[PDB]
Design a protein around this ligand. Structure first.
Ligand code: MG
Ligand code: MG
Ligand code: MG
Ligand code: MG
Ligand code: MG
Ligand code: MG
Ligand code: MG
Ligand code: MG
Ligand code: MG
Ligand code: MG
Ligand code: MG
Ligand code: MG
Ligand code: MG
Ligand code: MG
Ligand code: MG
Ligand code: MG
Ligand code: MG
Ligand code: MG
Ligand code: MG
Ligand code: MG
Ligand code: MG
Ligand code: MG
Ligand code: MG
Ligand code: MG
Ligand code: MG
Ligand code: MG
Ligand code: MG
Ligand code: MG
Ligand code: MG
Ligand code: MG
Ligand code: MG
Ligand code: MG
Ligand code: MG
Ligand code: MG
Ligand code: MG
Ligand code: MG
Ligand code: MG
Ligand code: MG
Ligand code: MG
Ligand code: MG
Ligand code: MG
Ligand code: MG
Ligand code: MG
Ligand code: MG
Ligand code: MG
Ligand code: MG
Ligand code: MG
Ligand code: MG
Ligand code: MG
Ligand code: MG
Ligand code: MG
Ligand code: MG
Ligand code: MG
Ligand code: MG
Ligand code: MG
Ligand code: MG
Ligand code: MG
Ligand code: MG
Ligand code: MG
Ligand code: MG
Ligand code: MG
Ligand code: MG
Ligand code: MG
Ligand code: MG
Lengths: 54, 112, 122, 116, 213
RNA sequence: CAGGUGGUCAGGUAGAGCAUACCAAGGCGUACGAGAUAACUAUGGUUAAGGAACUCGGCAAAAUGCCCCCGUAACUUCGGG
RNA sequence: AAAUUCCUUGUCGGGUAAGUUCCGACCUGCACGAAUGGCGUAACGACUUCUCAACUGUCUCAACCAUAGACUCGGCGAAA
RNA sequence: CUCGAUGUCGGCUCGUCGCAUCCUGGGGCUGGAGCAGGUCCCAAGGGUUGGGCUGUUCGCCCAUUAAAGCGGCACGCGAGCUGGGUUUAGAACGUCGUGAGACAGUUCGGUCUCUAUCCGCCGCGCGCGUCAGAAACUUGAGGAAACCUGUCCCUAGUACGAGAGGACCGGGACGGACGAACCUCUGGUGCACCAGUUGUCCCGCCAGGGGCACCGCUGGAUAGCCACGUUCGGUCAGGAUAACCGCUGAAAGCAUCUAAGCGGGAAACCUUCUCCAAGAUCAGGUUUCUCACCCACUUGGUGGGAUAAGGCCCCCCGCAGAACACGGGUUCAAUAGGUCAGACCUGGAAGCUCAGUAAUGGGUGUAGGGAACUGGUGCUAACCGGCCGAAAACUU
């Protein structure tokens, strides 16, 4: 099927606004006297030094 | 063990012999013909066990008048009076479904 | 189990050797025919010079079924060929005796003359 | 072990036996493997059932490991080093540690390593 | 007037009755319950009775729900449901804190057993509603399990409400009526109930005495 | 760009074979991925009892299948079939 | 009664439990016919048509399993 | 009305509606003895089969059934399927035309396109509202689904009838079709299960195994999912009624179901049974829990900050599942994996040893290998943590 008519501004901005990024949360890590922020799912590898903080 | 072994424990029957697929077995079945209570004998060849305790079944097989007939009883069924072991058997499988397509003298299971 | 277009061996001496199911009597749109069920049939093979001919429309009760049949005692029963006996309209066989064993479910369907002529009734 | 509920690793199920055979060879050889995370949840019941054959140490258990590992230089270190090291540990021989997901496909990654 | 109890589906097994027939049963641990609340018509508008069931650690129960058992003098349970009674001689036989066990049913009685059925996921039309499907050969281009038509034509230019389509099946509240209680087992807190019983093995099941009989 | 393009060389084990299966010499993993038991569609597999009752129609699928030895009909233009 | 027959599912015999199709005939050939050949014919056909044996998910009546998609996440990113 | 396109017959799948009713249900009249009928009245709740022939609708026929209803919806339904018929190009037969050709004559062959924007519909979430913030259990305004029926026995060979034949009303038993739940049994499936085996290559070789050949093929196969399987359902009783049957009774001293008034009365109607449901914006009810700060301004039912009860994200998973949701668990832990022991499937492992010229067979041994189902075990991962989140008053 093809679109019958073009959508209005109020109809194409309502759907497009629901395409967004779900931000993750961050916790505190102390490594070598330095503080950083990783997600909690990577909390073990930060303490094992397996996270390059760049 | 299972979760439901404290329910099936009073319904189990001791004094049932230890047979295997390939044996030849007499099975004494209680039959009610009106109000008579006679006792009919089924002599055949054990081909199957599908275990589980109270739910275990076996399948025997004979050749009545040129027509193969199977009966599938439950073990621990009180319609079986007593099972009596006649002849052992020397088989390699455990379900013996090749006996269904062999007639007559070619269904001879070995002795020991 | 037997439905329309099934071919059955015939377990008596009426001359018919193989019939072909047409209906399964006992209600409307009935699909299957176990042991002890009347069947309208058509005789597709017959011995030359007999009581029945090829092309007759007879009735018949099923006595042997390859599909397993549950009995109320927990047991099961399973024959190796499908067999029927041609009956009269008073539940009596047309022939004089029955070849092969027949099932015990003929005993509650009030077919008492077929059991007494059978060699072995299981 | 528990079979894979779902589509198998690498497409076919013939390929899943090959991927799990080459990851257990590399895990026993090095002691630490960086791989994707669903290929590391699958590895963990498969390598702990090859140390249990190695802890028993019989000939018949060695002939059973050789059904899965086609590398004799790592069957030796499984029966001479990895086997007797875990002799006083009742199961649980590996550890999965989650790493940053990799660029290019956002495939989440984990490391699987032996315990000590 | 209508007795009721809360239990757990433990599985199915078989058993043999007095005339040597086979009876497929379903073990339901109609466990020890406690009353914990009574609905009266001058306070609530109807008449019923709560029933608490199931062992739970007292730290998994939060502070609002812990207080509802404290005004009843009862240690907290896991599940809690009501037994809807009728308003004729309503609730004299229930008191708060009363123990209900599995031997309030007798052998040969009939029960209505209700629970939450098993999830079948997002199911199509030949599984959720028993459609026939089109043919599997003779040219049938890609319609082996599709529904086909769903309406008429330009009159009416709409699909009617209630049309049978695909979607999620299962997870429904299902009551199966008139099941025979084969044997009550007071030592184990076990009913043996003939036949199928809705739910997964381990789920919450309400057992009530039947009215159709 | 799943299409088209003439000629030469062409190993092993099984095999009648340049078929097919598995391999050598030598090449290649060919250029979006990671996941995930939804419906439905494609591509393959299996199915109790019945066996064309399907359908415009046995379409599709299933079946038959190799070597050696016996044996082989109507009809025929004497080759055949 | 045909690759020709409108009336027409002509009528008669055979085949199936039931045969508008099929095979054999009648002749009442709407409107066959002798090199725009008439009537036959062994062989041969990815032809048209009818029946039978064997076989099976075509079907009664569907159920399960794997894969490529569909669905989720990251990248690129069109069209009628 | 549509020619800058509104795609035709039948079948398939899925329906929905009317009653001009085929069956079942209720009645009047009868040239109704009974049994079965004829005709008319009321009634749409459900039910209404499988084949042969034809492209067929129509129609005949076979075998059944309680019956095999007649019609509307673009002669319902091709962005759902089919393409046999019809309406392209090929070819032939008959007839017409000197001919090209033609024939609501016949015959054989003949591409069925489309990634769903909007409304509709089946599902499932996010957001805010419900005058504080939360948690648990609920009433049901209003809707959805379901509604079919047979044979046999007893009452009784009684009522009726010269005979043949043969009941209404009540009571009981066993089925068919349909539906929903379910996996104990039967049966099917089984892509990390066990075993047999062919060809070939590799592991140095023998022995033992493995890769690939549709899972190479073959024999089985627990869990899960299922039907062919198990179990259950359509019930009982009330309320108001249709046709029809009355009671009392005038106008009209009689009579009349009616004008006042009161009853009987069916599968239709409303309750009762199962299910969804307070987004029912009148946004409900019973309870318990938190029941507390701090800062600034223009002192506002104002903005910020920090919390409580509680929840979410993350994590370990599920028989919960497209995402999301829902449910269990997080060291005070048996959630998953391991491990240990049972259950179950397979069918007697390797190694050694004995018998045999060998192929192979016996012993050690209900062996060994193994997944889902049950129970113990604190060994691996459930972590040393983030984000949300509580009240102007006033009138009687
Ligand atoms: Mg066993
Ligand atoms: Mg699986
Ligand atoms: Mg993929
Ligand atoms: Mg393979
Ligand atoms: Mg599921
Ligand atoms: Mg189908
Ligand atoms: Mg296509
Ligand atoms: Mg297809
Ligand atoms: Mg190219
Ligand atoms: Mg060429
Ligand atoms: Mg070669
Ligand atoms: Mg080749
Ligand atoms: Mg390329
Ligand atoms: Mg899939
Ligand atoms: Mg089949
Ligand atoms: Mg078969
Ligand atoms: Mg056949
Ligand atoms: Mg045929
Ligand atoms: Mg069909
Ligand atoms: Mg048909
Ligand atoms: Mg047909
Ligand atoms: Mg073909
Ligand atoms: Mg083929
Ligand atoms: Mg020929
Ligand atoms: Mg012809
Ligand atoms: Mg004719
Ligand atoms: Mg002819
Ligand atoms: Mg002429
Ligand atoms: Mg001439
Ligand atoms: Mg001429
Ligand atoms: Mg010619
Ligand atoms: Mg994307
Ligand atoms: Mg034009
Ligand atoms: Mg236009
Ligand atoms: Mg049409
Ligand atoms: Mg009417
Ligand atoms: Mg009448
Ligand atoms: Mg209707
Ligand atoms: Mg009603
Ligand atoms: Mg209609
Ligand atoms: Mg139409
Ligand atoms: Mg129509
Ligand atoms: Mg359309
Ligand atoms: Mg359209
Ligand atoms: Mg032409
Ligand atoms: Mg001319
Ligand atoms: Mg094509
Ligand atoms: Mg589409
Ligand atoms: Mg209501
Ligand atoms: Mg509303
Ligand atoms: Mg269902
Ligand atoms: Mg089981
Ligand atoms: Mg089974
Ligand atoms: Mg294996
Ligand atoms: Mg060897
Ligand atoms: Mg190779
Ligand atoms: Mg199973
Ligand atoms: Mg009533
Ligand atoms: Mg509710
Ligand atoms: Mg509320
Ligand atoms: Mg949660
Ligand atoms: Mg041995
Ligand atoms: Mg020797
Ligand atoms: Mg084990």
């Amino acid at each position: 099927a093809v679109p019958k008519r073009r959508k209005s501004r109020s109809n194409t901005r309502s759907r497009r606004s629901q395409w967004k990024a779900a931000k993750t949360e961050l916790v505190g890590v102390t490594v070598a006297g330095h503080a950083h922020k990783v997600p909690r799912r990577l909390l073990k590898a930060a303490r094992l030094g397996l996270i390059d903080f760049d | 063990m299972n979760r439901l072994d404290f329910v099936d424990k009073p319904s189990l029957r001791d004094d049932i012999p230890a047979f295997n697929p390939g044996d030849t077995i007499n099975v004494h079945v209680k039959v009610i013909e009106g109000a008579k209570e006679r006792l009919q004998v089924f002599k055949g060849v054990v081909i199957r066990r599908q275990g589980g305790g109270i739910r275990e079944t076996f399948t025997v097989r004979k050749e009545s008048y040129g027509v193969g007939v199977e009966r599938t009883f439950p073990v621990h069924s009180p319609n079986i009076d007593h099972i009596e072991v006649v002849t052992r058997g020397d088989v390699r499988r455990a379900k013996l479904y090749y006996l269904r397509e062999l007639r007559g003298k070619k269904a001879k299971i070995k002795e020991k | 189990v037997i439905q329309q277009e099934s071919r059955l061996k015939v377990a008596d001496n009426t001359g018919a050797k193989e019939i072909l199911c047409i209906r399964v009597l006992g209600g409307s749109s009935r699909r299957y025919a176990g042991i002890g069920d009347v069947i309208v049939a058509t005789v597709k093979d017959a011995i030359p010079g007999g009581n029945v001919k090829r092309g007759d429309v007879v009735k018949a009760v099923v006595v042997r079924t390859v599909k397993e049949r549950r009995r109320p005692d927990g047991s099961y029963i399973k024959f190796d060929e499908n067999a029927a006996v041609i009956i009269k309209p008073d539940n009596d066989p047309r022939g004089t005796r029955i070849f092969g064993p027949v099932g015990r479910e003929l005993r509650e369907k009030r077919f008492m003359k077929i059991i007494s002529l059978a060699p072995e009734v299981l | 072990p528990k079979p894979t509920k779902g589509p198998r690793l690498g497409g076919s199920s013939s390929h899943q036996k090959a991927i799990l055979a080459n990851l257990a060879t590399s895990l026993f050889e090095h002691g630490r493997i960086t791989t994707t995370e669903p290929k590391a949840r699958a590895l963990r019941p498969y390598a702990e059932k090859l140390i249990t054959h190695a802890k028993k140490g019989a000939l018949h258990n060695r002939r059973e490991v050789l059904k899965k590992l086609r590398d004799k230089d790592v069957v030796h270190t499984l029966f001479a080093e990895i086997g007797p090291f875990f002799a006083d540990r009742d199961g649980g021989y590996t550890r999965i540690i989650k790493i940053e997901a990799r660029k290019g496909d956002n495939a989440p990654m984990a490391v699987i390593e032996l315990v000590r | 007037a209508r007795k009721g109890i809360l239990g757990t589906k433990l599985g199915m097994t078989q058993v043999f009755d007095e005339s040597n027939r086979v009876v497929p049963v379903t073990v339901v641990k109609a466990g020890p319950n406690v009353v914990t609340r009574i609905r009266t018509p001058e306070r609530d508008g109807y008449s019923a009775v709560q029933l608490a069931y199931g062992e739970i650690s007292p730290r998994k129960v939060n502070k609002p729900l812990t207080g509802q058992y404290t005004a009843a003098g009862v240690n907290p349970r896991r599940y809690l449901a009501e037994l809807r009674l009728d308003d004729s001689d309503a609730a004299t036989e229930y008191q708060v804190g009363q123990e209900l066990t599995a031997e309030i049913f007798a052998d040969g009685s009939y029960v209505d057993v209700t629970g939450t059925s098993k999830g079948k996921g997002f199911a199509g039309t030949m599984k959720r509603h028993g459609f026939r499907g089109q043919g599997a050969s003779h040219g049938a281009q890609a319609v082996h399990r599709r529904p086909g038509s769903i309406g008429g034509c330009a009159t009416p230019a709409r699909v009617f409400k209630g049309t049978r389509m695909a979607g999620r099946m299962g997870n429904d509240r299902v009551t199966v009526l008139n099941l025979l209680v084969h044997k009550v087992d007071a030592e184990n807190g076990v009913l043996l109930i003939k036949g199928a019983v809705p739910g997964r093995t381990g789920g919450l099941v309400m057992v009530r005495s039947a009215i159709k009989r």
